[PDB]
Amino acid sequence: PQPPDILLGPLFNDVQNAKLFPDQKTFADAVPNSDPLMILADYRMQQNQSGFDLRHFVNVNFTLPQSLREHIDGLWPVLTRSTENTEKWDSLLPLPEPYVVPGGRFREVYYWDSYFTMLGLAESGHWDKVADMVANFAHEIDTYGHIPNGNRSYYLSRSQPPFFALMVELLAQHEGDAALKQYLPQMQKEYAYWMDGVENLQAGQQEKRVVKLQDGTLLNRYWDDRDTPRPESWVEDIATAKSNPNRPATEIYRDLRSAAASGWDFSSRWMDNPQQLNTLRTTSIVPVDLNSLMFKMEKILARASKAAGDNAMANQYETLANARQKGIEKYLWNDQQGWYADYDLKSHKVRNQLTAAALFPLYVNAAAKDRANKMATATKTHLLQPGGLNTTSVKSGQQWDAPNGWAPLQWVATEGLQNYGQKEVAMDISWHFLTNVQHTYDREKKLVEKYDVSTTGTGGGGGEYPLQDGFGWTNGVTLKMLDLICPKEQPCDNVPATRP
């Protein structure tokens, strides 16, 4: 499958640049009614004729795309899609089983979203859907060599935060070690993708998603194999590169795509100047969340191997995990500030900024106990707000920043804090975010993609597209949290005004 900019060449550029549709993702998801080569020969003939209408040419040649608890349960069918077969030349990639999409403009499965959605499904006893989704991701691993950002041809050149091993662990909570052993080959295969290029890597060098520091420490980074505009945000990325003539455009395209591989598209976290997206430099930053996830993946791989009966392999994975933990503790802790943070390959130091990503070492149990206590303090002091956990302390105009609260980060933070007995802060995050979700639901009768955490009752904003409704990981995380804040004796269908 070729991404639409390659498949439809000059025509794709021209349709996007003409802005025939208010969302750039629209034409990226359009299906050619006939062979692209034919539509392209045709376009070359007509395009310069008197009174040629581009829009008309496109219409002819393409097909274009109750309680809180009750509401979430009724949404699952609306968010479920089944696409075992796909039309010829569709950007949508086929999957063997039904899958849940986030909602709105997101009409395909997403990698990291699905873990948090599956948490909700698992909590509701929809273990069949959870099995189906693990199977879908295993299929993509075998088919593409890795999990794409989503099941679209324009997502094949990148991944997303790697939650597959955690999904397999989720499935094992129901099916036992049999699930770990079943999906071991695909977990190893995903690991080999993340580590591709390590062989022959020298100190001080990076290759694809692997970074080797000057002392030999191996860590990973986000990376996309392409350095061109994103088809799904074509005119935005061109405008971003055009606005900064002092950088090669390919470098800007690479970092835009890599921030998209990071899940945090976009954030002051990646930028020299928090008010200029054209300064982002994702590929020179070693992310603390990614490397926390890699640690977890290595720990899960060791467990699966040992269950499977392969002890030499289990010992290898445990040794790799032990080394990664030493790297996180050394390069991804900011000792001057007292919090985890990303590492800057440009300055050769730990970056200053506190973001919600700094909770990930707690989430995966990599963190030292004293650093976990320090993180509880940093969270209360800087990130915890009336409507939930702030993403950063910086209002950049981007969506992965203040004042936005994102469901997946609320879950990572509360689970992380609980892993170290920091129960008070963990409960405050859950209660604040849930109240926000409930309040917005009382107002709008919906769940949304992200929330403004400075108060409760309003959805968030920022970035290159409008606030989306649904919404997969909000619904999944909400159900999980709802079930935990109320006793099993008396479960709640709405978030209550009093803590029990």
Ligand X SMILES: OCC1=C[C@H](N[C@H]2C[C@H](CO)[C@@H](O)[C@H](O)[C@H]2O)[C@H](O)[C@@H](O)[C@@H]1O
Catalog residues that contact ligand X under the rule CB under 6 A.
102, 106, 110, 112-113, 149, 230, 232-233, 260, 263, 265, 464-465
Least CB distance to ligand X at residue 150 (A): 6
Consult the annotation and say whether 158 binds a ligand.
Answer: yes
Cβ-based nearer residue to ligand X, 325 or 391: 391
Least CB distance to ligand X at residue 230 (A): 5
Q: Which of 190, 227, 449, 452 is catalytic?
A: 449
Consult the annotation and say whether 186 binds a ligand.
Answer: no
The residue nearest ligand X at its CB is 260
Rounded CA separation 283/261 (Å): 10
Catalytic, 73? Answer: no
Least CB distance to ligand X at residue 106 (A): 5
Q: Kind and range of the H or E element at 32?
A: strand 31-32
Positive or negative, the CA dihedral 488, 492, 495, 498 is negative
By C-alpha distance, which of 186, 209, 368, 226 is closest to 291?
209
Cβ-based nearer residue to ligand X, 61 or 355: 355
Least CB distance to ligand X at residue 260 (A): 4
Consult the annotation and say whether 48 binds a ligand.
Answer: no
By C-alpha distance, which of 165, 106, 112 is closest to 409?
112
Cβ-based nearer residue to ligand X, 230 or 324: 230
Cβ-based nearer residue to ligand X, 3 or 274: 3
Consult the annotation and say whether 50 binds a ligand.
Answer: no
Rounded CA separation 435/496 (Å): 8
Catalytic, 199? Answer: no
Consult the annotation and say whether 231 binds a ligand.
Answer: yes
Q: Which of 227, 265, 289, 452 is catalytic?
A: 265
Least CB distance to ligand X at residue 154 (A): 8
Cβ-based nearer residue to ligand X, 116 or 420: 116
Residue 360, preceding bond cis, omega within 30 degrees?
no
Cβ-based nearer residue to ligand X, 325 or 392: 392
Rounded CA separation 340/360 (Å): 9
Consult the annotation and say whether 444 binds a ligand.
Answer: no
Consult the annotation and say whether 159 binds a ligand.
Answer: yes
Least CB distance to ligand X at residue 338 (A): 28
SS3 of 152, please? Answer: strand
Tell me the catalytic residues.
265, 449
* Sequence ranges of the binding site for substrate: 105, 112-113, 149, 158-160, 230-232, 263, 464
Q: Which residues are annotated as a binding site?
A: 105, 112-113, 149, 158-160, 230-232, 263, 464
